[PDB]
Design a protein around this ligand. Structure first.
Ligand SMILES: [Cl-]
Ligand SMILES: [Cu+2]
Ligand SMILES: [Cu+2]
Ligand SMILES: [S]
Ligand SMILES: [Zn+2]
Ligand SMILES: [Zn+2]
Lengths: 151, 151
């Protein structure tokens, strides 16, 4: 698979459509998210495409190598760690990520997994406490969607 | 994956949760759909896990072998043709289907595709008209969801 799409929804006003495209050994992640507070918000692929209990049932960050949480630039990171998206004064975050670790096929395929955008910034694993090494202290899950095959 | 899940939502009252489990070369499909009118309702895997335009953007019945529409027991069928679910008087349909054609991995994988429940019964390709060989005349799409990897 070379194209995927994800519609983010939550209990509040956050929404967005994310597109995925395979290019070489990377995945290009594009789209926009609206309704956010100005500033940074954590943004990750979570393990399960399970929305039975809202974004809660998505489980943890997708982490098949059982590594510590980090930023997308770090060698020590979860597969699903895509860092922060940034919303402007208008609550609009332009998603523009090129990632070498997520994939649309094979063992690290994120097809059928969940994108989650968070209430607060991802500290990228540098917060100094145990929770930073797991979730980056990005806080509550505002909106999420299951990643699907796109035309 | 070897287990999957799908949360159905729509513009009306129909909702549901579908569960999938791989057993040998079959998929065991369980769960329930609520808010339906009494009787049979068409139930299919559609091609795209694309919820940008409600259930419309899911595309046609999942049909990688380019066959005509049928019932689940027929040799001539779409991969996605799971037939009819049956709602009782209180509008609840209990889903209990074991299928040898859909898969949760490999070429026939439905991970990242869409489950759709329909307005009318599926005539299983035996209606006699042009639409019967394409959709089974199941009518409008009441609810849908992207099929996600489950724990
Ligand atoms: Cl088709
Ligand atoms: Cu997250
Ligand atoms: Cu259908
Ligand atoms: S359809
Ligand atoms: Zn992480
Ligand atoms: Zn069909």
């Amino acid at each position: 698979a070379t194209k995927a799409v994800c519609v983010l929804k939550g209990d509040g006003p956050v929404q967005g459509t994310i597109h995925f495209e395979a290019k070489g050994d990377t995945v290009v992640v594009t789209g926009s998210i609206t309704g956010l507070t100005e500033g940074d918000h954590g943004f990750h692929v979570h393990q399960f495409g399970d929305n039975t209990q809202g974004c809660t049932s998505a489980g943890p960050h997708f982490n098949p190598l059982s590594k510590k949480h980090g930023g997308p630039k770090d060698e020590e990171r979860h597969v699903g760690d895509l860092g922060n998206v940034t919303a402007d004064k208008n609550g609009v975050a332009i998603v523009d990520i090129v990632d070498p670790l997520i994939s649309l096929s094979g063992e690290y395929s994120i097809i059928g997994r969940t994108m989650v955008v968070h209430e607060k910034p991802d500290d990228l694993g540098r917060g100094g406490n145990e929770e930073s090494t797991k979730t980056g202290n990005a806080g509550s899950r505002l909106a999420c969607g299951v990643i699907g095959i796109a035309k």
